């Protein structure tokens, strides 16, 4: 009869992308342990220095330099959890961050401009808190955007109050998905904590168990931890708020031209932050992240739509998998000023390498202009791209059924599979893009001979006009607004 | 002192892309050997059927179905060369096609329309032998295009002369790079042989030794070998011209919806061709090719800029490496009607996968509109994209030098590497795109706020107006031109 | 949201069992190649010797010793197909034999006695043609019995006609499954070809395309190919009949005591048979088979229900996979004289090793008494055993779905999965034995306190009395039956 | 000359069985860690909750639910010893339990009924303290039974005294092999400690250095730790008594139908016990154990002679080897009510998988009726089966010697190996079962046509009548018997 008994079989599910051998991973590690001991790392916050000192680090109090011994890096790595869950106000949006290759996406964060349509053209203008609400609504709709990362700055609130706290409630209000704050303020973490506690009716345990808010911080390249960064880490750990320690080194600028050497600088900085985190509160939820890229000597810019950004982010994901931590890297980025042929290429180049490598969170969707501008058109374009990427990540599934010899035989020479029952059952198996155009020249011309950007634009308009976002309870929202008012007051009363 | 003695070290040069385990490759293989025996393959050319029969295949002379035993597949694979060199008129354009991961690129082939600027916009018009000449010049300039593949059809010669023979001399004349004929005619292969024989001053040995010409043929899916195809294979092997057996199956159409099954249909078709080739002339140069894709039931078309094409082309390179043969697959393709955001995406999606997998030749550069139109703008864009893919393929080189600890220590905390000597020696190390814009908004606007398409268009212009292509010797050209005329004369008969 | 994107993932489907490293496989091989050149093999059939000589073998005509060079062994292996299909009269019984781990089972063959209940107990008596007809019917029912191998000898025909030809038509008439003749007679192969040709209305092409008959032969240990063995090979290749070159070596008797040495003897013998085949007709369907076992120096018998037999068969399956050929090995065998506790153990020991190893066909089902007797009871029992083995061969399928963390969480602490919808959907997922009793003492005693043996017996009766077999066309049969009568007359004509 | 210089050669000693890739193991791990945090584990004992809380666990005192952070699992796994020795009164019975593949067997534990021969037939009757003594004497004789595990309950002591304490001295007295108590009482652990201390004449150090006693506890599925379990873990750790954290989950009942999901449940449960142990006393000797099985909805029982049981037990060994701990799993089990064809099969099915997988201890020998009954016949039978399993585990040793080409060449074509000197020297190499019958029909019938069951019954009678057990020193036994009396006296006064 047809067999239904197969001895042990070796299989490959998806697509494997390799950049290192264990030997090489260790080489990078040793080099990092070497850097951590000399020069070491400049920890500007005194409270952080005391944490390091207490636990074994040598601390030069006049130069603020800390030398982290390898055993503390080991201890930290054994304390950090291998996974944690990001919650949304809508449980269906909960996103998992786990060591391994489960890839997820989030939008770029955080620009100072927005790419919008004025009088028959796309004009890049300064962003305002209002823009955040709109983008939050769009991302709430975009399926492939697992959670929300502060897209643009509420520049209009600058100097007027606690802008960072405004950048907390606006997002939480305009989307039910998890919120990741790219621009947190160390001294104001208590407000973020209070906002979330307010959402959960004053129940801090609830807030800790179902965190709807997390934050990011960047070590200062090369080899420094600013006062703000140290406080974000320490307060994140103590309040139970997921903290993303993301690097921002620059090859040929703040780190070696070579990528391996750059990863070393990145590794030293990120590990220092994670160590501080675990030393403050053992078991603190943390990300091993990066947006480190290459500096373009010949242009005077730090291109982030280049193959180097893709390779570096992919490498960082491999390093996080090597260390047992969840990763958060830059991807789906571009240096193009408009949603053109360039944006498409770069977005795909910088997203595919990190995705195939297994980055747990790839951020950059919707970004344009080397991380300066945010485009709603590019956001929906990128979202559709991730759908194509997820299909590719399916690789080739090999099984008696997928080989389908009987089908090939039933059809026979010179026929077609259109009528076949198996075929009609797999009607939804192939990739089905939302915006990408797969029509004959005719149908496309008759539709207006529109390009992707314009098609995307029409999509944005529809979403913003007809998408419903799960609103926060009328009363709870007031409790939350109260915290923002309190923050603005404290800010203005100097 | 500084170390200068390290024990055995395991390294990864480049970026490795894996899609199969050996057990899965075998499973696919068995499925194919199963299909080759039942239903088997329908060979239309009687000469080919005789070749197959003479060697052991069962040939039903009424249905024309040929059943190929597995031992013949093995014999064919033991005969086919693992590598061969493609020659251009200019030795500097020589390209190797070898089993493994050495990647190369070639333009698409062959469209019927051309996307060109008209009265303020890009208008897609039908192709002519003149268009071929222009593209050949553009590609002759594009560094990441190793050899030239027939881009568009010389439609203006249809029913007026031997179109295929015109499509042979025009390319050879307009570019010093090797030429790959996508639309050869079985009966006219001798014209081609002579064209080349002429180029080498009437020396056939030199033509065989330094082939500047090669052909492509497609088995008819599912499981068929048309008369034209068998003849291209037979004469190709007999004349010493590399033949590319490239599949054109369609998931949901001529092969199962599942990619694995599709790969089986493909494997059966391509191998049957390769078997014929080796049976004809043991040692004939051949390519394990593919442009197989999926059928969008929902859009009534066959998207070729999809993640599916990329996967298929990637898997075929792996099957090729598994069978010990050079590969030629679709890649750097798109379904967009214009060089927009969509084009850039699909071009990269379909090129990155086959490239990282190690496809020896990825073709599709310059193509748009599901393989209907060719675009010089997209072509130069693609060319720039390939430069970026090549940087990506460099991966992360790990060595004491690249780890650069001493540099990190010398620069120290809070400083920068700008003035570092090592940094200045590596000024050309980073990727440096030709078209892609890496400037800030200021400088970009100050340049007219141009998108990639226009920037590219301007490049096309500059190239077509100034690039110098090494021309064939006047005398020699007459000899070749003669064969074309002779062939056209015959056509009118 | 819930993840739906995973980077390359290494998986293990089923259970893998390993016995050798590539270095050890090669070691066995070199040993084999050395033995084939010295002392070589005694080919008693002059026609086969000729075939060998013509292709390059040194043949000593006065001793019949043929030394086979390694390049011929290589040539044969490259010529032999990696797979082929065994057809039944009922296409639904078709069975694939392919290099790899696709396992299948067939009954034992061929005994000279039958274990059956007489008057209050089991009595083992010599077999008769009628026994074959009943065992064929039984096996037609048993699902895990892919095809049918000549169970016992039609001993009552001895001395009256062509017993081997009777042994062909009876099986084919009593089951619609493919028939594997274990006692073919080199000289009568033409009769078998004709029976099958008759079944297909005189179409030899159809007979070659849909083989319902295949045969087995044994090299003579140590290192000999008898005339009968050579003729079965030569004619099978020439008539398009799948031939099983199966060894019957014996550790301590016809090969070294060590199992490696034994595999070397087995290897030389089996490969010589395969070479002959491919040299006779390139591409001839052949099996790499074995029923080689160890001799019990202490008991003066050849135990076939021992771990040694299980190990040998498993190793042979690995050697077959190593050489790229389908395997046919002894398994599910016992040395017990009755279907008892010993039976169950030995049957399981000797079937599990070869199954996990990946043997393409495991024969031995129904056998007892060291290969002398066939038991219908033990046959239905073995069939049930094969179901449990098929379940075990599933191993642990690891996927997000099978890990079911949500189910565990939804059910929570101190509760059960009985009402969970997922649970009721998998009502047929667990193993469900046909005979093995899983009832509480109460229900068991209430059913008669019957042991597996008698429960098995009751099943036999039921199947024999009610199972329906697809009959052969009355007229086609007549034509086949005629071939038998013809052979019987020629036989008597001495 | 003959070679005696061979470069690096890769070899395989034994039979390797594989079920998981490292990725799959990790996947089972993450799922388990996720479950240890939500829903977490219900620890009923208040002393245990304190132990957890003190070390960083979130403990909900109202629900008694403990959430174990991944860093504590890691810590416990780093503290637990990779190996430890089980002592017997006779140093020769000392059994090592070490992370890896060194397999050992022990009898089942613990039934409520015994399967014996009354008046012409086998009758299943309730057990008594005397039955423990007998079975202990039988297991003392069985060589493949490394140590003794409380086989049946001393029911005749129920309600009239400290049953468990009687179930301690009796075993120790009736066998000189290590004793594993399957049903220890948390509150009476001090009694066991004193009994052992008594054996070593008051030297508590010796008792700790040469443990002749160890115990087992079962987490309550799903996700629960009873007061008794916790006390066993804690006292065991503090007194220096090896503790076996053994799961008893059940697919489709207290855990998901899928095997993977069931493993997760098992993991969460067992690891919680191990964490408790290490936190109580770092370095405490423990086992990663299991007897988790499937539930047959179609039969209303939890079959333990199923392929599922074998798979689960084998998986638990692989997981243990992954975590670096010694394993103790169920195997050599059957659902049959009598020692018949079924018993033999299941026993082998469920012992071979874990054995080939490397379980450090497989318990179940002598058991019948889904874990309800203990059969001395099935015990000696199982013990013999293990001897066959041990031979199978030899796999194929490949060396110039075992390949024995010179031997093959010496004997030559068509000859015999019996007379060969090498063969005579290897007469004890082949498997030599004690009960399994390998005689030709004649000799067997002459011996009575006895099946394995009856043959076993005879060996039982012979052992029980003639086997000698090294007795405990008369004086020492007095002190020991005293503790038991003191325990009983205590039981009565309440
Ligand atoms: Na796959
Ligand atoms: Na590298
Ligand atoms: Na598995
Ligand atoms: Na071995």
- Distance CA(B475)–CA(B484), nearest Å, equals 15
Assess A282–D contact: CB distance below 8 Å, yes or no: yes
CB D472 within 8 A of CB D170: no
Q: How many CA atoms lie within 13 A of A274 on its CB side?
A: 33
Nearest to C7 among A17, A93, A146 (CB): A17
**CA D174 to chain centroid:** 19
Query: Rounded to the nearest 5°, which phi and psi values hold at B456?
Result: -65, -50
Q: Interhelix angle for B129-141 vs B452-466, to 10°?
A: 100
A303 by DSSP, 3-state: which? Answer: coil
Residue to test with chain A: of D38, D59, D70, most A Cβ within 10 A:
D70
Q: What is the DSSP string of C368-412?
A: EGGGTEEEHHHHHHHHHHHHHHHHHTT----SHHHH-HHHHHHH-
Assess whether the previous peptide bond of D222 is cis (omega < 30° from 0). Answer: yes
Sequence-distant (6+) residues with CB within 8 A of A77 are A274, A278, A323, A324, A325
C296 by DSSP, 3-state: which? Answer: strand
Which residue is associated with the tokens 């700055």?
Answer: A153
Please name which of A339, A250, A263 lies closest in space to residue A303, comparing C-alpha atoms.
A250
- Distance CA(C263)–CA(C247), nearest Å, equals 10
Other beta carbons within 10 Å of B443: 13
Which residue is associated with the tokens 């002519």?
Answer: B128
**Contact yes or no for D19 and C252 at CB 8 A:** no
Q: What is the DSSP string of D144-190?
A: T--BEE--B--GGGTTTS-HHHHHHHHHHHH-SS-EEESS--GGGHH
Chains D and B touch (3+ CB pairs under 8 A): no
- Distance CA(C322)–CA(B74), nearest Å, equals 17
D400 by DSSP, 3-state: which? Answer: helix
- Distance CA(C193)–CA(B285), nearest Å, equals 43
From C486's Cα to the closest Cα of chain D, the distance in A is: 37
- Distance CA(B23)–CA(B34), nearest Å, equals 16
- Residues near ion ligand 3 (CB < 5 Å) are C 12, 395-396
- Sign of the four-CA dihedral B257, B258, B261, B263: positive
Other beta carbons within 10 Å of D356: 27
From A214's Cα to the closest Cα of chain D, the distance in A is: 19
CB A192 within 8 A of CB A165: yes
Nearest to B71 among C8, C79, C100 (CB): C79
Angle at C437 between CA D372 and CA C388, to 5 degrees: 110
Method: X-ray
What are the structure tokens assigned to D269, written together? 């449960």
- Distance CA(B280)–CA(B278), nearest Å, equals 5
* Torsion (CA) A167, A168, A173, A179 in degrees, nearest 10: 110
Q: Interhelix angle for B259-280 vs B70-79, to 10°?
A: 70
* Torsion (CA) A378, A379, A381, A385 in degrees, nearest 10: 130
- Distance CA(D252)–CA(C315), nearest Å, equals 37
Sequence-distant (6+) residues with CB within 8 A of A31 are A264, B403, B405
**Contact yes or no for B71 and C78 at CB 8 A:** yes
Q: Report CA-CA distances (Å) from D364 to D128, D215, D307, D417.
A: 19, 16, 15, 41
Q: Report CA-CA distances (Å) from D265 to B35, C391, C425, D35, D145.
A: 45, 21, 20, 8, 30
- E strand segments, D263-410: 286-290, 293-294, 327-330, 362-365, 367-368, 373-375
- Distance CA(A320)–CA(A244), nearest Å, equals 12
The resolution, in Å, is: 2.5
Q: How many CA atoms lie within 13 A of B379 on its CB side?
A: 33
Chains C and D touch (3+ CB pairs under 8 A): yes
Chain C adjacent subunits, 3+ CB pairs under 8 A: A, B, D
Q: How many CA atoms lie within 13 A of D70 on its CB side?
A: 23
Please name which of C128, C126, C152 lies closest in space to residue C139, comparing C-alpha atoms.
C152
What is the Å distance from ligand 2's center to D23 Cα?
A: 22
Chains D and A touch (3+ CB pairs under 8 A): yes
- Distance CA(A285)–CA(A278), nearest Å, equals 9
Q: What is the CA radius of gyration of chain B?
A: 24
Tell me the H-state helices in A243-323: 259-280, 307-323
- Sign of the four-CA dihedral D126, D127, D129, D133: positive
What is the Å distance from ligand 2's center to B13 Cα?
A: 4
CB C253 within 8 A of CB C244: no
- Distance CA(B309)–CA(B293), nearest Å, equals 5
* Residues across chain D: 494
Cβ-based contacts of C124 with chain D (< 8 Å): 441
Sequence-distant (6+) residues with CB within 8 A of D432 are C296, C298, D387
**CA D181 to chain centroid:** 11
What are the structure tokens assigned to A365, written together? 């969707």
After which residues do gaps appear in chain D, with C to N over 2.5 Å?
Answer: none
Portion 41-80 of B in contact with A at CB < 8 A: 41-42, 65
How buried is residue C169: exposed, middle or buried, by Cβ count under 10 Å (0-12/13-18/19+)?
buried
Other beta carbons within 10 Å of D113: 21
Q: Interhelix angle for B452-466 vs B376-392, to 10°?
A: 100
**Kind of pairing between the strands at D105-107 and D362-365:** parallel
CB A369 within 8 A of CB A336: yes
Spell out the long-range contacts of C193-199 with Cβ–Cβ below 8 A and sequence spacing 24 or more: C193/C235, C193/C239, C193/C241, C194/C483, C195/C165, C195/C168, C195/C169, C195/C480, C195/C483, C195/C484, C198/C476, C198/C479, C198/C480, C198/C482, C198/C483, C199/C89, C199/C172, C199/C472, C199/C476, C199/C480
CB B232 within 8 A of CB B263: no
Portion 379-408 of A in contact with C at CB < 8 A: 389-390, 393, 395
Residue of chain B whose alpha carbon sits nearest to that of C77: B71
- Sign of the four-CA dihedral A348, A350, A353, A356: negative
C148 by DSSP, 3-state: which? Answer: strand
Q: Interhelix angle for A376-392 vs B341-357, to 10°?
A: 30
How buried is residue A410: exposed, middle or buried, by Cβ count under 10 Å (0-12/13-18/19+)?
middle
- Distance CA(D350)–CA(D344), nearest Å, equals 10
Which residue is associated with the tokens 């329906």?
Answer: C468
D113 by DSSP, 3-state: which? Answer: strand
- Distance CA(B463)–CA(B457), nearest Å, equals 10
- Distance CA(C280)–CA(C298), nearest Å, equals 43
- Distance CA(A394)–CA(C43), nearest Å, equals 55
C111 by DSSP, 3-state: which? Answer: strand
**Contact yes or no for A7 and C358 at CB 8 A:** yes
- Distance CA(C107)–CA(C147), nearest Å, equals 8
Q: How many CA atoms lie within 13 A of C91 on its CB side?
A: 2
Assess A281–C contact: CB distance below 8 Å, yes or no: no
**Contact yes or no for C1 and A96 at CB 8 A:** no
Backbone dihedral region for residue A252 (phi beyond 0: left; psi -120 to 50: alpha; all else: beta) = left
A90 by DSSP, 3-state: which? Answer: coil
How buried is residue B336: exposed, middle or buried, by Cβ count under 10 Å (0-12/13-18/19+)?
buried
- Distance CA(A175)–CA(A95), nearest Å, equals 14
Assess D248–C contact: CB distance below 8 Å, yes or no: no
Q: Report CA-CA distances (Å) from D317 to D149, D288, D387.
A: 19, 8, 21
* Torsion (CA) C285, C287, C288, C290 in degrees, nearest 10: -150
Which residue is associated with the tokens 């100034």?
Answer: B466
What are the structure tokens assigned to B329, written together? 């697959």
How buried is residue D358: exposed, middle or buried, by Cβ count under 10 Å (0-12/13-18/19+)?
buried
Sequence-distant (6+) residues with CB within 8 A of B49 are B43, B59, B61, B64, B66
Residue of chain A whose alpha carbon sits nearest to that of D26: A100
A479 by DSSP, 3-state: which? Answer: helix
Which residue is associated with the tokens 């409520």?
Answer: D112
Query: Rounded to the nearest 5°, which phi and psi values hold at C115?
Result: -95, 115
- Distance CA(A375)–CA(A383), nearest Å, equals 12
Tell me the H-state helices in C2-44: 22-37
CB B2 within 8 A of CB A374: no
- Distance CA(D284)–CA(D234), nearest Å, equals 10
Sequence-distant (6+) residues with CB within 8 A of C114 are C124, C125, C126, C127, C131, C152, C373, C374, C375, C376
Q: How many CB pairs under 8 A join A and C?
A: 124
- Distance CA(A343)–CA(B458), nearest Å, equals 19
What are the structure tokens assigned to A96, written together? 């998992």
- Distance CA(B100)–CA(B97), nearest Å, equals 9
- Sign of the four-CA dihedral A230, A231, A237, A241: negative
Please name which of C146, C151, C148 lies closest in space to residue C128, comparing C-alpha atoms.
C151
Other beta carbons within 10 Å of B450: 17
**Kind of pairing between the strands at C113-117 and C122-126:** antiparallel
CB B391 within 8 A of CB B433: no
Q: Report CA-CA distances (Å) from D131 to B192, D162, D171, D200, D374.
A: 97, 17, 10, 26, 10
* Per-residue DSSP letter, D87: P
The helices-and-strands tally (H runs, E runs) of chain C is 18, 22
């Amino acid at each position: 009869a047809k067999n239904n008994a197969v001895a042990g079989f070796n299989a490959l599910n998806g697509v494997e992308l390799n950049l290192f051998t264990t030997d090489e991973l260790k080489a990078i590690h040793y080099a990092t342990m070497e850097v951590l001991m000399d020069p070491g790392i400049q920890v500007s916050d005194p409270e952080a220095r005391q944490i390091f000192k207490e636990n074994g680090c040598e601390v030069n109090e006049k130069t603020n330099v800390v030398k982290i011994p390898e055993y503390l890096v080991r201890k930290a790595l054994q304390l950090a959890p291998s996974r944690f869950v990001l919650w949304g106000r809508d449980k269906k949006f909960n996103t998992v961050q786990e060591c391994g290759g489960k890839v997820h996406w989030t939008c770029f964060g955080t620009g100072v401009k927005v790419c919008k349509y004025q009088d028959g053209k796309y004009v890049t203008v300064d962003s305002v808190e209002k823009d955040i609400a709109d983008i939050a609504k769009l991302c709430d709709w975009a399926e492939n955007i697992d959670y929300f990362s502060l897209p643009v700055s509420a520049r209009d609130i600058a100097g007027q109050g606690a802008q960072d706290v405004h950048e907390t409630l606006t997002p939480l209000a305009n989307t039910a998905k998890h919120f990741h704050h790219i621009d947190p303020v160390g001294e104001n973490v208590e407000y973020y904590r209070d906002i979330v506690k307010a959402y959960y009716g004053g129940d801090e345990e609830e807030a800790r168990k179902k965190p709807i808010f997390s934050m990011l911080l960047c070590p200062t390249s090369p080899l420094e931890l600013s006062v703000n960064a140290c406080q974000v880490i320490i307060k994140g750990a103590r309040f139970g708020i997921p903290v993303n320690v993301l690097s921002m080194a620059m090859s040929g600028g703040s780190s070696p031209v070579y990528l391996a050497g750059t990863l070393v600088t990145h590794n030293a900085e990120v590990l220092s932050g994670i160590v501080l985190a675990q030393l403050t509160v053992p078991g603190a939820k943390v990300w091993y992240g990066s947006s480190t890229t290459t500096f373009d000597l010949k242009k005077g810019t730090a291109p982030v739509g280049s193959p180097e950004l893709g390779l570096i982010s992919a490498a960082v994901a491999k390093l996080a998998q090597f260390y047992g931590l969840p990763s958060y890297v830059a991807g789906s980025x571009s240096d193009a000023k408009v949603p053109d042929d360039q944006a498409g290429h770069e977005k795909t180049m910088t997203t595919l390498l990190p995705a195939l490598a297994g980055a747990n969170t790839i951020y950059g969707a919707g970004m344009l202009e080397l991380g300066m501008t945010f485009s709603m058109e590019q956001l929906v374009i990128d979202n559709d791209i991730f759908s194509m990427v997820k299909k590719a990540m399916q690789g080739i599934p090999v099984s008696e059924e997928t080989l389908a010899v009987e089908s090939i035989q039933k059809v026979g020479i010179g026929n077609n599979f259109l009528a076949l029952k198996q075929t009609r059952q797999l009607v939804d198996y192939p990739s089905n893009p939302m915006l990408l155009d797969r029509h004959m020249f005719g149908d496309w011309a008759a539709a207006g001979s529109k390009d992707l950007a314009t098609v995307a634009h029409e999509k944005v308009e529809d979403v913003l006009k007809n998408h419903q976002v799960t609103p926060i309870d009328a009363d709870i929202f007031k409790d939350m607004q109260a915290i923002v008012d309190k923050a603005d007051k404290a800010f203005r009363g100097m």
